[PDB]
Amino acid sequence: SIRIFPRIAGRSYIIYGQTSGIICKRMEKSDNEFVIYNYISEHYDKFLKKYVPKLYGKNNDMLLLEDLTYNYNNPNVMDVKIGARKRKSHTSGFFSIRGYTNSHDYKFDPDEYLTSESTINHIKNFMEAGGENRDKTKQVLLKWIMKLSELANDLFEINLKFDGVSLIFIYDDDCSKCDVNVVDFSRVKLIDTNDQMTISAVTNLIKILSELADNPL
Numbered sequence: 474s475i476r477i478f479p480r481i482a483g484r485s486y487i488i489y490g491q492t493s494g495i496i497c498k499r500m501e502k503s504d505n506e507f508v509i510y511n512y513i514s515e516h517y518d519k520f521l522k523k524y525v526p527k528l529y530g531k532n533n534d535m536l537l538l539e540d541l542t543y544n545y546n547n548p549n550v551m552d553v554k555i556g557a558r559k560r561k562s563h564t565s566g567f568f569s570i571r572g573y574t575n576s577h578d579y580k581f582d583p584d585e586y587l588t589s590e591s592t593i594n595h596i597k598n599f600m601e602a603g604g605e606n607r608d609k610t611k612q613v614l615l616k617w618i619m620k621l622s623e624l625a626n627d628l629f630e631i632n633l634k635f636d637g638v639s640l641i642f643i644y645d646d647d648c649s650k651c652d653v654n655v656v657d658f659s660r661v662k663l664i665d666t667n668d669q670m671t672i673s674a675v676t677n678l679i680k681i682l683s684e685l686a687d688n689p690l
């Protein structure tokens with residue numbers, strides 16, 4: 474019995490693993506994603522441990538990846554592309570929200586270019602599922618800011634172009650647990666400097682989330 478994994482975005486074949494806590498992702502165009510996990514493992518092991526789901530193995534053209542939603546009763550997931558898009562410019566300036574849990578209920582369209590005001594409204598839409606205890610939703614926002622802060626810092630010292638990578642924001646309905654990790658290395662490339670487009674995406678999100686944690690309404 475093959476069980477299809479409930480993606481929030483993208484074109485890739487992702488099924489639940491035969492086993493608890495794993496998803497399998499088909500590398501469709503090349504094994505570049507595998508080359509890149511293994512390169513980050515050699516040269517930036519600390520970055521891998523803190524910010525990337527664990528790669529457990531490869532089976533032909535499938536990566537056996539840590540399921541980021543596994544320890545969640547009621548996960549809310551949001552995919553934000555922070556790396557360069559292939560051709561298009563970003564739908565929210567420095568980044569592109571690709572989807573989120575219940576996005577359909579707020580007539581979210583991934584092809585729509587958004588104002589600052591609309592971008593913030595879509596992130597606020599993503600947080601509705603967390604209920605109205607604004608104390609525990611601030612805690613979710615702050616714990617995301619804590620890890621994005623460190624990621625923006627660490628990214629200055631990493632000589633990769635993160636073309637096409639996303640942040641996966643997760644929080645539980647009861648707001649008791651949350652996390653953000655970096656995924657989708659299939660178009661990442663080696664370069665001789667750091668990636669300022671990707672750092673500006675993260676710093677922008679940190680700005681947006683800070684505004685929400687401080688906003689007193």
Ligand SMILES: O=P(O)(O)O[C@@H]1[C@@H](OP(=O)(O)O)[C@@H](OP(=O)(O)O)[C@@H](O)[C@H](OP(=O)(O)O)[C@H]1OP(=O)(O)O
Nearest residue numbers: 482483484554557558559560561571636637657660
């Ligand atoms: O966002 P870019 O421009 O890079 O390409 C995107 C592409 O978007 P498009 O070429 O703008 O239509 C997406 O197609 P849909 O939006 O699902 O129709 C695709 O599904 C990957 O989007 P996701 O990363 O959201 O899947 C891909 O990205 P990649 O993995 O870099 O080939």
Ligand SMILES: Nc1ncnc2c1ncn2[C@@H]1O[C@H](COP(=O)(O)OP(=O)(O)O)[C@@H](O)[C@H]1O
Nearest residue numbers: 480481482483484485526539540541552656657
């Ligand atoms: N390790 C993971 N744990 C949980 N969900 C994941 C994981 N990796 C990817 N996903 C889900 O799959 C979607 C797309 O994955 P991604 O790596 O961006 O692949 P693609 O190359 O198809 O865009 C994300 O929006 C997310 O919901």
Ligand SMILES: [Mg+2]
Nearest residue numbers: 483637639657
């Ligand atoms: Mg992707």
